[PDB]
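Anyone able to model this chain together with O81?
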Amino acid sequence: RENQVYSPVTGARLVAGCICLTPDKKQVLMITSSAHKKRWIVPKGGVEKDEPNYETTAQRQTWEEAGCIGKIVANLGTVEDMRPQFENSRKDSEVAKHPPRTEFHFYELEIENLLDKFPECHKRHRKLYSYTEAKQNLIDAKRPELLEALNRSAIIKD
Ligand SMILES: O=P(O)(O)O[C@@H]1[C@@H](OP(=O)(O)O)[C@@H](OP(=O)(O)O)[C@@H](OP(=O)(O)OP(=O)(O)O)[C@H](OP(=O)(O)O)[C@H]1OP(=O)(O)O
Ligand SMILES: [Mg+2]
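re: yes, here you go
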């Protein structure tokens, strides 16, 4: 729908999501992408014009995409999808300047329940991963900005 909300500055699509952690904080909940069937990501989605805050969007998408209920325990701030040839400064190399694709507002959630039936339960897989596994999945998914969000969480990395 054209019910989506965009940054008035950069025109980046405004998305909220959840780093959903087990109470012991040893594992994060990950879902498969709908387009890229084999790629493991975290629950997230576009803010809608009616929604009063990012927490609403985040908890709605965590239910819809992952059948996961929990309490938001931290605001993990923002990360950007910086995807659209190169510009070399002679001490480093960078991609040619462009506006961000997406601006993500992430929250840490403590999982309280996982339900077997949820809206996207037939079009996605869903599973708990240790930090090391989760980190490798996000690299495999080519989503370093989601890994940045994961890294700000209280997930045990040792
Ligand atoms: O192509 P990507 O990787 O940039 O991401 C995809 C993202 O998929 P992802 O790869 O993040 O898993 C899709 O979401 P999905 O995972 O639910 O299929 C999402 O579709 P959407 O309109 O439902 O938007 P959300 O991703 O719930 O905010 C967007 O897809 P669309 O091309 O079908 O409209 C998004 O695309 P962008 O506009 O580029 O952000
Ligand atoms: Mg999504």
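Helices lie at 54-66, 131-141, 144-152.
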